[PDB]
Structures are given as C-alpha cells and as structure tokens.
Design a protein around this ligand. Structure first.
Ligand SMILES: O=C(O)[C@@H]1[C@@H](O)[C@H](O)[C@@H](O)c2nc(CCc3cccc(Oc4ccccc4)c3)cn21
Ligand SMILES: *[C@@H]1O[C@H](CO)[C@@H](O)[C@H](O)[C@H]1NC(C)=O
Ligand SMILES: *[C@@H]1O[C@H](CO)[C@@H](O)[C@H](O)[C@H]1NC(C)=O
Lengths: 76, 384
C-alpha cells in the first residue's frame, strides 16, 4: 500500500566517521578459562574456521572473572 | 566469585586460538590484587608479561572489569583517581618490556547510571594519557526477564543512543579525541535471554547497535561472546554458527570503514532503522564509490524504500536475512535471499550470494527482517 512506501535521505558529501577495519570484534568471557574443556574447545578446527571468518577483529579475553584470575607459572 | 589460577598452557591455548584465527588478543589483567595502601600490586602481571615476552606473544592489555561494581563484587572500593594511577603503573611496566609499543585500553566501566560518570571522569583525568582507547560496556536487558517484545521494541533499541551521548559527554570533558570502544556488549546480561539471545530475533539489537555505534563515533564494538556458556554466543556449544554469526559475516563482507548517514522522511520513524557506509570494495563485485545501505524493519508489514536522487536508477544488490522455519524469529537458522546459511564443511564458509534487483525498483523489506543493499556505480567521491 501507498503508506508502506518510505523515502530515504542520504548524506554522502564526506565520511562522518572512520571505524576500525576491526569495528566488529568479539570476546571470550574470562570465565571460559575455568572450564576444564577450555583446551579442547579453543582447539576446535571448526571454531577456528568460524573465527578466521571474522578476521580482522580484536578478541577480548575478559569479564567479571578478570578480577578473580591469578597467573601460576608453576601449575599445569 | 572466588579466585582461580590459570597456567602457561591456558595462555598458550588462548594465544594460539587468536593467532591461527587472525585475531588481535586483548588480555584483561586482575585489578583487585592490592597492597596495604590499596595500590595495584603489579607483581602477578609482571610474571605474566615475562612469560608472554619469553614466547614472543604480541598481546594488548586491559586492567580490571567494571570497577564501579568492585565494592559489590569484592568489598574493595577503588576510586577512579587510583585506577588512573594503576593504569600509569601498568603503562610503565609495558614500556620497560618487549611489549613497549603494545596497546593499553580501559577502564571497561558499565553503561552510564546515576553516578558511573564520576569514576570514568576521575579515571580519564588521572590515567587518560596512557590508554589508546576508552572501553565501556552496554547491555539492553536482563536475560532473566527479557521478552520477545523487548527484542523487537524500537524504544529498547533507542535507549542505547543516550548511553553513547552520556559516555561522549565524560570523554569530551577530559580526553577529547580519544577513541571510544564498546569493550563488552550484547543483548542481555546474566548470560543472555534463553531462545532470544541465540536466535534470529537477536539480530535486531546486534545490527542496530553496529549501525548506531558507527554513526555516533564508536571505533570498535566487542561482541559478548564469540563462543561460551552465554545464550548470546555467536557460535553454540556444538561449534555451530547462530544467526548473529551469519549477520556479523555479512556485515564484514559488505560494510566499509567510512560511515555516512541515511534517514527516513516522516514525523516519527523508529521502526524503520537505516544506516549508510561506503561499500567494502575488497569484494571484486563492487568498486570505488559504491554504497552499502542496511535497514531493519520492525513493522509487522513489508515496507518499500525509495533511494533518493541521484541513486534512484542504480543497480542494487539485495542481501536479505530471514529465519529458516518453523520457529520464525525464535529460529537458530537463517536464509540469505531464500538460501539457508550453513558451513560447506568444518574448513569452508559458503559464498554469501547477492540478489540483483531490477534498476528503479523500491527496496522491499519484509516485516521483522533486516537487509543490506549495495548501490552499484554510486560513484560517491567521499568513498574515494
Ligand atoms: O552478565 C553477563 O552476561 C556479562 C558477564 O558474563 C561478564 O563477565 C560481565 O563483564 C558483564 N557485565 C555486564 C554488564 C552489567 C551491567 C552494568 C550496568 C547496567 C547494565 O544493564 C542494565 C541495567 C539496568 C537496566 C538496563 C540495563 C548491566 C554483563 N556481563
Ligand atoms: C581515592 O583513593 C585513594 C587510594 O585509595 C585515596 O588515598 C584518595 O584520597 C582518594 N581520592 C579521592 C580524590 O577521593
Ligand atoms: C499489525 O499490528 C496491528 C496491531 O497494531 C494489527 O491489528 C494488525 O492486524 C497487524 N498486521 C499484521 C499483518 O499482522
């Protein structure tokens, strides 16, 4: 119907902002590091194919557990 | 939350995943390791930096997650000024290491509430000089209470605009020109909303967030999460991609770094949301000057978009995303122009195939759907 047709205005004179090529980036929650399957999961060739699809991107390892994790150079 | 340790092996797993995937790892350091005088004790971090140094790991750093809730989380209150001084300490460590030109981001504060500005403002005053970007977090909903209607509600989407304006108010007052990042963001806190955060319905909030972020000057948007326990994961527990994964892939294929602007004529227009960038011209189908429009329709009927002069007779490629049935918006499967999106195999993503429209046609956008449209031969000089 006529009421379902909508007109667009465009601004094209100049870039209003320049985002990073990595604009769409992703996280792993710091809590995944407490999962016993952590090594198995991030080892997944399938998971790596999917992650490579989002390249370029930042991967941020963090979350609430950031402030409750301690590096042990001796364990594991 | 209680303390846990992690191993060299843990760091190796995470670094290898990032490196083999072509992603840039940012690692959050523990900011609740404190001295008697409640300075940041840096000695654990020095252990980690030495190990990463020794392995030639190219890594970037954060310090703390959501400092304004440290009193709730741990009965330790750290004001913004002290956190600034801690970032200065971390900066000096990084500069005395093989990570001397490694990046530093912070302070990963939550979205603006009655008095969260005070911490970000006193933090940027104190430590703003040593951070490469300001990171903050945004969620729209509580995963426990979020409804299907909330996920489709233009009033929910719009609240994000005020969060962004309030963040930029603090940053412009203290570190004008500093890059602003969403360091952690998704649909719903508490791990996401079951059957909503992992479905086609999640795509409204995800694409609108990307649109508004780019339009308002956010440089980087970090999606909680790529993979993990939360319903807001882009990839599920079987390593299968959910609709937001395919959305994210299609965004990266079509959308360039140069942000432009689209708007709809009419008094109120909250349910038809439109965003405009230069086309990503890495794709050999497209050339310099091409435009990528993306649009969300939250009306319950098809809407038809008319391109303004002088683009009304251009050839347009449609990239329309709709759920694969029978679960409609609650589907975990998505079709691009009526073809279901699936991995060809564990090593192989499918092509993302355009549907060419006849030149001079209005852009059809069905009820509760989102679409990219590439305007070919647009010859926009701003896109070089
Ligand atoms: O809860 C989560 O899923 C994640 C958690 O996995 C991550 O490890 C952790 O870093 C985190 N922070 C937030 C944001 C918490 C927050 C703070 C302030 C306001 C928020 O959202 C609203 C509050 C009130 C009304 C509407 C939104 C959410 C969410 N999350
Ligand atoms: C902030 O915290 C520091 C360190 O705990 C304290 O010594 C200082 O007085 C506080 N400063 C302000 C400005 O409140
Ligand atoms: C759209 O919404 C209205 C309720 O406002 C309803 O009466 C109408 O039938 C709906 N149309 C469709 C096609 O579902």
């Amino acid at each position: 119907a006529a009421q379902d047709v909508v007109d667009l205005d465009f601004f094209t004179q100049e870039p209003l902002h320049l985002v990073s090529p990595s604009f769409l980036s992703v996280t792993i929650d710091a809590n995944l590091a407490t999962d016993p399957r952590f090594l198995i999961l991030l080892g997944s060739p399938k998971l790596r194919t999917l992650a490579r699809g989002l390249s370029p991107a930042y991967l941020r390892f963090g979350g609430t557990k950031t402030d409750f994790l301690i590096f042990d150079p001796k364990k594991e | 939350f209680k303390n846990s340790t992690y191993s060299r092996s843990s760091v190796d797993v995470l670094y290898t995943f990032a490196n083999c995937s072509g992603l840039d790892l940012i690692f959050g350091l523990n900011a609740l390791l404190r001295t008697a005088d409640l300075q940041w004790n840096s000695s654990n971090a020095q252990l980690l930096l030495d190990y990463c140094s020794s392995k030639g790991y190219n890594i970037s750093w954060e310090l703390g997650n959501e400092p304004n809730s440290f009193l709730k989380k741990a009965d330790i209150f750290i004001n913004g000024s002290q956190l600034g001084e801690d970032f200065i300490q971390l900066h000096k460590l990084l500069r005395k290491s093989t990570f001397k030109n490694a990046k530093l981001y912070g302070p990963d504060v939550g979205q603006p509430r009655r008095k969260t500005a005070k911490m970000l403002k006193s933090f940027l005053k104190a430590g703003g000089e040593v951070i490469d970007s300001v990171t903050w977090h945004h969620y729209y909903l509580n995963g426990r209470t979020a409804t299907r209607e909330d996920f489709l509600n233009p009033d929910v989407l719009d609240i994000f605009i005020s969060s962004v304006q309030k963040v930029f108010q603090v940053v412009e007052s203290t570190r004008p020109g500093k890059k602003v990042w969403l360091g952690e963001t998704s649909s719903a806190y508490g791990g996401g909303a079951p059957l909503l955060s992992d479905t086609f319905a999640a795509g409204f909030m995800w694409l609108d967030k990307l649109g508004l972020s780019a339009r308002m000057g956010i440089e980087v948007v970090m999606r909680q999460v790529f993979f993990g326990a939360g319903n807001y994961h882009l990839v599920d527990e079987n390593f299968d991609p959910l609709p937001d994964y395919w959305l994210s892939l299609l965004f990266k294929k079509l959308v360039g770094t140069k942000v432009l602007m689209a708007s709809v004529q009419g008094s109120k227009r909250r349910k038809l949301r439109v965003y405009l960038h230069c086309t990503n011209t890495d794709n050999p189908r497209y050339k310099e000057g091409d435009l990528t429009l993306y649009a969300i329709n939250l009306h319950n009927v098809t809407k038809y978009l008319r391109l303004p002069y002088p683009f009304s007779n251009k050839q347009v490629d449609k990239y329309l995303l709709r759920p694969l049935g029978p679960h409609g918006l609650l589907s975990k499967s998505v079709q691009l122009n009526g073809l279901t999106l699936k991995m060809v195999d564990d090593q192989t993503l499918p092509p993302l195939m355009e549907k060419p429209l006849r030149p001079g046609s209005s852009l059809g956008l069905p009820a509760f759907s989102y679409s990219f449209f590439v305007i070919r031969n647009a010859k926009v000089a701003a896109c070089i």
